[PDB]
Design an enzyme around this catalytic site. Structure first.
Site, PDB file in Angstrom:
ATOM      1  N   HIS A 117      89.169  -3.956 -63.406  1.00 42.77           N
ATOM      2  CA  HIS A 117      88.613  -3.094 -62.000  1.00 42.77           C
ATOM      3  C   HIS A 117      88.711  -4.281 -60.825  1.00 42.77           C
ATOM      4  O   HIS A 117      88.241  -5.330 -60.902  1.00 42.77           O
ATOM      5  CB  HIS A 117      87.502  -2.594 -62.114  1.00 42.77           C
ATOM      6  CG  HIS A 117      87.488  -1.256 -63.144  1.00 42.77           C
ATOM      7  ND1 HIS A 117      86.402  -1.225 -64.151  1.00 42.77           N
ATOM      8  CD2 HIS A 117      88.162  -0.305 -63.052  1.00 42.77           C
ATOM      9  CE1 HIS A 117      86.703  -0.031 -64.833  1.00 42.77           C
ATOM     10  NE2 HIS A 117      87.749   0.531 -64.254  1.00 42.77           N
ATOM     11  N   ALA A 118      89.527  -3.880 -59.937  1.00 43.51           N
ATOM     12  CA  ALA A 118      89.723  -4.594 -58.772  1.00 43.51           C
ATOM     13  C   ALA A 118      88.587  -5.409 -58.101  1.00 43.51           C
ATOM     14  O   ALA A 118      88.636  -6.610 -57.869  1.00 43.51           O
ATOM     15  CB  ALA A 118      90.503  -3.961 -57.657  1.00 43.51           C
ATOM     16  N   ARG A 119      87.489  -4.991 -57.900  1.00 47.36           N
ATOM     17  CA  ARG A 119      86.425  -5.276 -57.171  1.00 47.36           C
ATOM     18  C   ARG A 119      85.478  -6.302 -58.195  1.00 47.36           C
ATOM     19  O   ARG A 119      84.623  -6.839 -57.548  1.00 47.36           O
ATOM     20  CB  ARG A 119      85.723  -4.237 -56.348  1.00 47.36           C
ATOM     21  CG  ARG A 119      84.847  -3.390 -57.386  1.00 47.36           C
ATOM     22  CD  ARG A 119      84.389  -2.131 -56.922  1.00 47.36           C
ATOM     23  NE  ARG A 119      83.639  -1.152 -57.804  1.00 47.36           N
ATOM     24  CZ  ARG A 119      83.400  -0.064 -57.356  1.00 47.36           C
ATOM     25  NH1 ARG A 119      83.784   0.632 -56.129  1.00 47.36           N
ATOM     26  NH2 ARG A 119      82.741   0.893 -58.380  1.00 47.36           N
ATOM     27  N   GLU A 120      85.756  -6.389 -59.319  1.00 41.63           N
ATOM     28  CA  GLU A 120      84.976  -6.996 -60.212  1.00 41.63           C
ATOM     29  C   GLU A 120      85.454  -8.479 -60.437  1.00 41.63           C
ATOM     30  O   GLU A 120      85.640  -9.024 -61.395  1.00 41.63           O
ATOM     31  CB  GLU A 120      84.890  -6.464 -61.594  1.00 41.63           C
ATOM     32  CG  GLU A 120      84.031  -4.832 -61.791  1.00 41.63           C
ATOM     33  CD  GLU A 120      84.461  -4.252 -62.832  1.00 41.63           C
ATOM     34  OE1 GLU A 120      84.171  -2.858 -62.686  1.00 41.63           O
ATOM     35  OE2 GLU A 120      84.902  -4.329 -64.031  1.00 41.63           O
ATOM     36  N   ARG A 167      88.587  -0.169 -56.591  1.00 36.43           N
ATOM     37  CA  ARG A 167      88.498  -0.275 -57.847  1.00 36.43           C
ATOM     38  C   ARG A 167      89.706   0.128 -58.710  1.00 36.43           C
ATOM     39  O   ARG A 167      90.076  -0.733 -59.660  1.00 36.43           O
ATOM     40  CB  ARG A 167      87.241   0.852 -58.439  1.00 36.43           C
ATOM     41  CG  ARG A 167      87.153   1.073 -59.757  1.00 36.43           C
ATOM     42  CD  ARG A 167      86.333   2.476 -60.095  1.00 36.43           C
ATOM     43  NE  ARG A 167      86.111   2.845 -61.425  1.00 36.43           N
ATOM     44  CZ  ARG A 167      85.336   2.114 -62.434  1.00 36.43           C
ATOM     45  NH1 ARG A 167      84.745   1.134 -62.068  1.00 36.43           N
ATOM     46  NH2 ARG A 167      85.193   2.655 -63.548  1.00 36.43           N
ATOM     47  N   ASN A 212      90.466   2.197 -66.635  1.00 35.75           N
ATOM     48  CA  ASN A 212      89.776   2.355 -67.819  1.00 35.75           C
ATOM     49  C   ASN A 212      89.258   3.902 -68.130  1.00 35.75           C
ATOM     50  O   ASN A 212      88.267   4.150 -68.805  1.00 35.75           O
ATOM     51  CB  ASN A 212      88.381   1.480 -67.562  1.00 35.75           C
ATOM     52  CG  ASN A 212      87.855   1.119 -68.873  1.00 35.75           C
ATOM     53  OD1 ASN A 212      88.859   0.699 -69.983  1.00 35.75           O
ATOM     54  ND2 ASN A 212      86.726   0.662 -69.090  1.00 35.75           N
ATOM     55  N   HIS A 229      84.312  -6.929 -67.729  1.00 32.45           N
ATOM     56  CA  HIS A 229      83.935  -6.384 -66.307  1.00 32.45           C
ATOM     57  C   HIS A 229      82.523  -7.121 -65.851  1.00 32.45           C
ATOM     58  O   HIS A 229      82.084  -7.971 -66.364  1.00 32.45           O
ATOM     59  CB  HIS A 229      83.761  -4.797 -66.794  1.00 32.45           C
ATOM     60  CG  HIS A 229      84.829  -4.052 -67.229  1.00 32.45           C
ATOM     61  ND1 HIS A 229      85.424  -3.050 -66.662  1.00 32.45           N
ATOM     62  CD2 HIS A 229      85.646  -4.215 -68.481  1.00 32.45           C
ATOM     63  CE1 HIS A 229      86.427  -2.379 -67.373  1.00 32.45           C
ATOM     64  NE2 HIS A 229      86.613  -3.261 -68.646  1.00 32.45           N
ATOM     65  N   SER A 230      82.513  -6.381 -64.734  1.00 30.50           N
ATOM     66  CA  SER A 230      81.053  -6.568 -64.208  1.00 30.50           C
ATOM     67  C   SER A 230      80.544  -5.206 -63.471  1.00 30.50           C
ATOM     68  O   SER A 230      81.711  -4.398 -63.044  1.00 30.50           O
ATOM     69  CB  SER A 230      80.840  -7.859 -63.233  1.00 30.50           C
ATOM     70  OG  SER A 230      81.710  -7.154 -61.845  1.00 30.50           O
ATOM     71  N   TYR A 231      79.332  -5.036 -63.128  1.00 30.28           N
ATOM     72  CA  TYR A 231      78.291  -5.932 -63.665  1.00 30.28           C
ATOM     73  C   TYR A 231      77.471  -4.962 -64.424  1.00 30.28           C
ATOM     74  O   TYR A 231      77.431  -3.783 -64.512  1.00 30.28           O
ATOM     75  CB  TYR A 231      77.563  -6.415 -62.226  1.00 30.28           C
ATOM     76  CG  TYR A 231      76.951  -5.076 -61.484  1.00 30.28           C
ATOM     77  CD1 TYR A 231      77.960  -4.553 -60.287  1.00 30.28           C
ATOM     78  CD2 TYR A 231      75.647  -4.706 -61.479  1.00 30.28           C
ATOM     79  CE1 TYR A 231      77.670  -3.323 -59.786  1.00 30.28           C
ATOM     80  CE2 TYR A 231      75.166  -3.705 -60.807  1.00 30.28           C
ATOM     81  CZ  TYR A 231      76.009  -3.017 -59.960  1.00 30.28           C
ATOM     82  OH  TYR A 231      75.784  -2.069 -59.078  1.00 30.28           O
ATOM     83  N   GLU A 257      79.892  -6.660 -69.525  1.00 31.99           N
ATOM     84  CA  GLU A 257      79.739  -6.524 -68.174  1.00 31.99           C
ATOM     85  C   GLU A 257      78.885  -7.748 -67.995  1.00 31.99           C
ATOM     86  O   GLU A 257      77.770  -7.992 -68.090  1.00 31.99           O
ATOM     87  CB  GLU A 257      78.716  -5.121 -68.106  1.00 31.99           C
ATOM     88  CG  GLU A 257      79.503  -4.039 -68.397  1.00 31.99           C
ATOM     89  CD  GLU A 257      80.316  -3.749 -67.164  1.00 31.99           C
ATOM     90  OE1 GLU A 257      80.519  -4.584 -66.230  1.00 31.99           O
ATOM     91  OE2 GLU A 257      81.382  -2.850 -67.151  1.00 31.99           O
TER      92      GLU A 257
END
Ligand SMILES: CC(C)[C@H](NC(=O)[C@H](Cc1ccc(O)cc1)NC(=O)OCc1ccccc1)P(=O)(O)O[C@H](C(=O)O)c1cccc(NC(=N)N)c1
Ligand SMILES: [Zn+2]
Length: 304
Positions: A64-67, A122, A139, A192-194, A266
């Site tokens: 996921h792009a923003r993580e 995302r 995902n 991943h996060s968060y 996460e």
């Protein structure tokens, strides 16, 4: 200028994959397992002391792009591996006996977009027929109860599941690689996060995996281990009840392929900064996560 305690743009991460491999050919080989929608190279780093028929653990970051802390962790892991091999007994044994397949950034196109345009992006950056809306949630794009729950059929939504499982070049590329190496891959770890959690299957349904007791005990020990360093508290459990139901995830798919140890991590935090985790927390976040990952590896190796 690459730094392990800053978030690096793709240009920098790519140059890093070349450099770190060049400087450590006796511990790293770099291959590309495919191209993204926008033609970027999906690098995979095989980390380990080379040898014939080695078992493997597969780990990816940057679904996921923003993580951004996810991408940071894969880079951190690779340095720890190369720097401590031959000195720290556990890592030395790990790299001698198995390979880590480390995929540092899966969704490269999205990650680039979080740098150039939209930090909260995302999904992938593929086009969709019949609309201006961009992107599929990688995902939600795997063949695991595909698109049946916790997913959208609308390309304008953040959890768009795609036109079909593996419709995205990136998820097809990951699935193909794992499918072609099933005999060797003993664990699947996706970062991943968060939320500070370790999740295991299932998320696409409330059914529990055959070895859910073992996975629960494994997750519980790993979170205890992670906490020993800085006191950071994680929770753990099956995805569906621990965070939310959601179909089409790679962890559930990998498990249903016969990979018995499958976990979504996460990382920090719990929502104070959310996806925008300060660079000042990169080091501590990566250090404690290392402990959990090494714990799981030690377990998997000892149970071959
Ligand atoms: C903060 C994380 C929990 C991430 N979640 C998000 O960004 C979600 C994605 C989403 C967007 C729209 C919508 O209608 C429903 C969901 N968005 C969001 O704001 O999350 C906030 C939040 C924060 C903490 C706990 C629950 C929710 P994630 O890393 O994307 O979470 C994974 C995912 O949803 O793909 C995830 C987490 C745990 C297990 C799995 N495995 C699986 N097979 N589903 C997958
Ligand atoms: Zn994520």
């Amino acid at each position: 200028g690459h730094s392990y305690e800053k978030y690096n743009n793709w240009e920098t991460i790519e140059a890093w994959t070349k450099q770190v491999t060049s400087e450590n050919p006796d511990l790293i080989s770099r291959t590309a397992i495919g191209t993204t929608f926008l033609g970027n190279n999906i690098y995979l780093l095989k980390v380990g002391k080379p040898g014939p028929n080695k078992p493997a653990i597969f780990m990816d970051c940057g679904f996921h792009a923003r993580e951004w802390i996810s991408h940071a962790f894969c880079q951190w892991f690779v340095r720890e591996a190369v720097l401590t091999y031959g000195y720290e007994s556990h890592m030395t044994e790990f790299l001698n006996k198995l390979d880590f397949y480390v995929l540092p950034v899966l969704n490269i196109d999205g990650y680039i977009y979080t740098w150039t345009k939209n930090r909260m992006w995302r999904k992938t950056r593929s086009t969709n027929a019949g609309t201006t809306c961009i992107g599929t949630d990688p995902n939600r794009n795997f063949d695991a109860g595909w698109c049946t729950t916790g997913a959208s059929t609308d390309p304008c939504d953040e959890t768009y599941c795609g036109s079909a499982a593996e419709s995205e070049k990136e998820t097809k590329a990951l699935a193909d690689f794992i499918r072609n190496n099933l005999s060797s891959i003993k664990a699947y770890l996706t970062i991943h996060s968060y939320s500070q959690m370790i999740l295991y299957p299932y998320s696409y349904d409330y059914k529990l995996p055959e070895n859910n007791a073992e996975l629960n005990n494994l997750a519980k020990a790993a979170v205890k281990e992670l906490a020993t360093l800085y006191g950071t508290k994680y929770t753990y459990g099956p995805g569906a009840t621990t965070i939310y139901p959601a179909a089409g995830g790679s962890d559930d798919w990998a498990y249903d392929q016969g990979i018995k140890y499958s976990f979504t991590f996460e990382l920090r935090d719990k929502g104070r900064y959310g996806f925008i985790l300060p660079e000042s927390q990169i080091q501590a976040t990566c250090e404690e996560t290392m402990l959990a990952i090494k714990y799981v590896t030690n377990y998997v190796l000892g149970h071959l």
